[PDB]
Amino acid sequence: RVKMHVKKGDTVLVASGKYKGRVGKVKEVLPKKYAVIVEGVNIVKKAVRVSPKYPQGGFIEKEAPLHASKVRPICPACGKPTRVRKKFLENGKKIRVCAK
Amino acid sequence: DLRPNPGANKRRKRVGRGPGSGHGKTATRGHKGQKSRSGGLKDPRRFEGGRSTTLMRLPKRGMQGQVPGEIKRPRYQGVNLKDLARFEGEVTPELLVRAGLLKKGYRLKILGEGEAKPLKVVAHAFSKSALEKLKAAGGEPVLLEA
């Protein structure tokens, strides 16, 4: 609603910057930030050494959100924008000389 | 032509007059320098002194007007011969408005200086000198009122 977009829980390419050319699976959509996740971009989160679940250690991070505009879908080829087909009754998205 | 230099020629001068700076119109402000320079005077035109201005002259130009208003009466508008010369045929009002003088001013009265010409002229009044010159070849449509 007003904030829907291009991709979801599928395979994508990253034409971004530092991690250009990278390709990854389900990007856990936000979308209240227009970011995703993929398996790219990692950093080093300090993480204080508290017992809860990090009993003495601290310096492990997860996957950076990554602004959704920097990713592009890929199917039976490389990138390419996206088109929409009727499905003769329901509704589905197809590429441009490809599918879904 | 082109975007550059289409600019106003010679005298455009927008440069108004700002009075604020050591050079030009400082302090006082390009005039003033005393007091009674703040929001205005009283005119002068007619006003001030504390005297009689110049309302001592009497208005013998009587007949100011009664309350009901001015009296509706037919007003006449002149037009010398010099003008008319311009065109031939039969000159008439309406025909004169849809051209030069008159224009609704009501009631045409041809007259004065200029040479007459062989052409009928429909009017409402005629000066002596008009009837004269025109007798020497030319119209005379007078009377009207119908």
Partner: protein, 63 residues
């Protein structure tokens, strides 16, 4: 907005074609008796100078 013409002027002055202010001579509305014929007689019309520009400004539109 839109100047108004001064009715006290129009009612007592008239502007000629050359642009000259003209008005009635003053001094004969109730002095008469021990005034010579020459006085009362010499009451026609007259000009005005320097004052007709300040004067003319009030008969703006009537021209």
């Amino acid at each position: 907005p839109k100047m108004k013409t001064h009715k006290g002027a129009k009612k007592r002055v008239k502007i000629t074609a050359s642009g000259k202010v003209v008005a009635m001579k003053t001094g004969k509305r109730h002095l008469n008796w021990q005034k010579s014929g020459k006085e009362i007689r010499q009451k026609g019309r007259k000009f005005v100078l320097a004052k007709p520009e300040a004067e003319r400004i009030k008969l703006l539109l009537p021209y």
